Amino acid sequence: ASEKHFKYVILGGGVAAGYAAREFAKQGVKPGELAIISKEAVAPYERPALSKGYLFPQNAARLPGFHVCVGSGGERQLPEWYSEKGIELILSTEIVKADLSTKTLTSAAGATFTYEILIIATGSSVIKLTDFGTQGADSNNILYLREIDDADKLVAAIQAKKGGKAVVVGGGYIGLELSAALKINDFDVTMVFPEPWCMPRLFTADIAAFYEAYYTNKGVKVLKGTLAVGFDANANGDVTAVKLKDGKVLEADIVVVGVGGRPLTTLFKGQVAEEKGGIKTDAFFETSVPGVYAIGDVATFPLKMYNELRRVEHVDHSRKSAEQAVKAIKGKESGESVPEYDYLPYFYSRSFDLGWQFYGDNVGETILFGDSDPTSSKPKFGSYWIKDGKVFGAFLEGGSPDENNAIAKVAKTQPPVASIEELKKEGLQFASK
Numbered sequence: 001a002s003e004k005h006f007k008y009v010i011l012g013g014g015v016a017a018g019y020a021a022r023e024f025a026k027q028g029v030k031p032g033e034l035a036i037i038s039k040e041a042v043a044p045y046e047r048p049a050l051s052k053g054y055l056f057p058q059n060a061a062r063l064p065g066f067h068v069c070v071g072s073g074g075e076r077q078l079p080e081w082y083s084e085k086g087i088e089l090i091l092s093t094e095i096v097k098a099d100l101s102t103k104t105l106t107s108a109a110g111a112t113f114t115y116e117i118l119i120i121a122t123g124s125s126v127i128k129l130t131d132f133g134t135q136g137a138d139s140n141n142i143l144y145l146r147e148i149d150d151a152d153k154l155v156a157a158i159q160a161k162k163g164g165k166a167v168v169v170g171g172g173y174i175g176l177e178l179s180a181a182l183k184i185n186d187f188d189v190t191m192v193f194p195e196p197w198c199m200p201r202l203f204t205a206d207i208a209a210f211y212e213a214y215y216t217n218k219g220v221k222v223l224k225g226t227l228a229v230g231f232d233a234n235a236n237g238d239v240t241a242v243k244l245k246d247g248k249v250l251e252a253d254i255v256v257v258g259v260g261g262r263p264l265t266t267l268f269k270g271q272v273a274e275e276k277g278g279i280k281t282d283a284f285f286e287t288s289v290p291g292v293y294a295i296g297d298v299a300t301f302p303l304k305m306y307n308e309l310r311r312v313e314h315v316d317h318s319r320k321s322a323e324q325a326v327k328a329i330k331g332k333e334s335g336e337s338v339p340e341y342d343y344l345p346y347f348y349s350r351s352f353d354l355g356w357q358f359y360g361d362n363v364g365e366t367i368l369f370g371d372s373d374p375t376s377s378k379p380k381f382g383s384y385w386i387k388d389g390k391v392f393g394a395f396l397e398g399g400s401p402d403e404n405n406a407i408a409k410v411a412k413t414q415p416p417v418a419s420i421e422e423l424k425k426e427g428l429q430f431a432s433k
């Protein structure tokens with residue numbers, strides 16, 4: 001009798017959930033039809049803000065300001081946006097069991113929820129140094145950043161330790177955005193990572209060299225090809241230092257770690273087909289279980305333009321896959337045709353006064369173009385990835401919305417390159433024309 005049933009259940013209260021709810025309201029959802037179950041205590045928000053505006057030392061972004069869908073220029077969805085529509089937000093509720101055969105979800109406290117259609121939007125986990133048993137990685141003030149709860153703990157630690165020393169472990173987008181956030185919050189910052197350069201799975205050595213030099217000039221000590229092998233801590237269990245493989249010690253009042261993550265799909269293992277580490281879906285985000293969909297970070301879906309199954313961690317995909325799934329679900333109900341998902345990979349990052357965008361596929365060979373001098377007033381440079389005589393990928397730092405739209409069009413249309421050398425001479429003009 002305490003069990004709750006909903007025609008549609010979104011599991012997770014993140015970017016994809018929030019955008020899926022907007023498409024349900026667009027599609028004409030009736031009160032009582034939809035529930036969003038989330039372990040977070042707040043309504044869906046624009047997660048990229050957590051490593052950006054949330055950490056500003058002045059005029060920081062705070063909720064309710066960055067709830068979905070403001071991040072894409074849409075309208076804000078306060079908790080009241082859901083309740084007025086009879087869309088039930090079930091917050092601070094962690095689902096610990098999902099039985100797809102009985103369409104039942106069970107919470108940690110044993111509350112049960114059944115559905116007709118399930119949308120899996122559980123996002124990604126955070127890989128922790130304690131997962132590998134790294135010596136003293138359990139020390140207090142060794143922090144990770146995924147959710148607003150993490151962001152609040154980081155904000156509190158920054159206030160407690162400001163004027164102090166911070167070490168950032170990891171050289172990916174988290175490493176880069178957090179090193180900058182700590183520096184702008186008046187910390188002595190050291191960035192350490194074992195790979196030969198930052199954003200190792202996306203940046204080329206030449207792109208990374210710009211960021212390493214720019215960070216160095218901001219006063220960030222960048223230690224590439226360096227491995228953190230332990231941590232020192234005091235009688236309170238608070239971190240005091242980061243030990244390096246060579247034997248060096250970095251003093252630290254705070255340590256922030258960003259070493260990637262994995263699709264949070266533990267609830268569904270063995271119940272749905274998996275591919276390339278994610279839950280496999282078709283062009284409509286439907287899994288191997290009929291009526292079960294998977295969106296955002298967890299989906300391994302058909303990337304139409306590359307004729308392959310892919311998995312991404314992009315806020316743009318999170319928003320668009322959410323809209324696709326809802327359109328597909330409502331399409332099956334009415335028997336109306338829905339086009340296959342046609343996504344152009346798009347990733348971006350911002351730190352200090354920098355901002356870059358990437359579109360397409362980072363395959364083939366690379367060429368660098370523009371002004372890549374880190375001391376430039378307004379640096380503006382890019383890179384193209386060329387394979388089989390055509391541009392597959394495009395990167396641009398410091399572009400205007402027009403220049404970013406131009407490099408997106410290059411990645412979308414994959415124009416031929418008769419002369420790669422000649423493309424390097426054309427640079428940013430190649431995209432704009």
Ligand SMILES: Cc1cc2nc3c(=O)[nH]c(=O)nc-3n(C[C@H](O)[C@H](O)[C@H](O)COP(=O)(O)OP(=O)(O)OC[C@H]3O[C@@H](n4cnc5c(N)ncnc54)[C@H](O)[C@@H]3O)c2cc1C
Nearest residue numbers: 012013014015016039048095122123296297313314315318
């Ligand atoms: C700090 C940060 C900065 C980022 N910056 C950028 C950026 O600049 N550009 C970019 O393109 N991408 C960025 N990303 C990536 C982007 O935010 C993600 O791709 C996006 O959030 C994916 O949305 P999602 O809905 O799939 O997952 P999430 O937004 O993570 O949503 C998952 C939700 O499900 C909940 N959940 C999970 N398991 C359960 C459970 N068992 N029970 C209940 N609730 C559960 C979670 O608590 C959360 O509410 C960033 C990510 C982070 C963490």
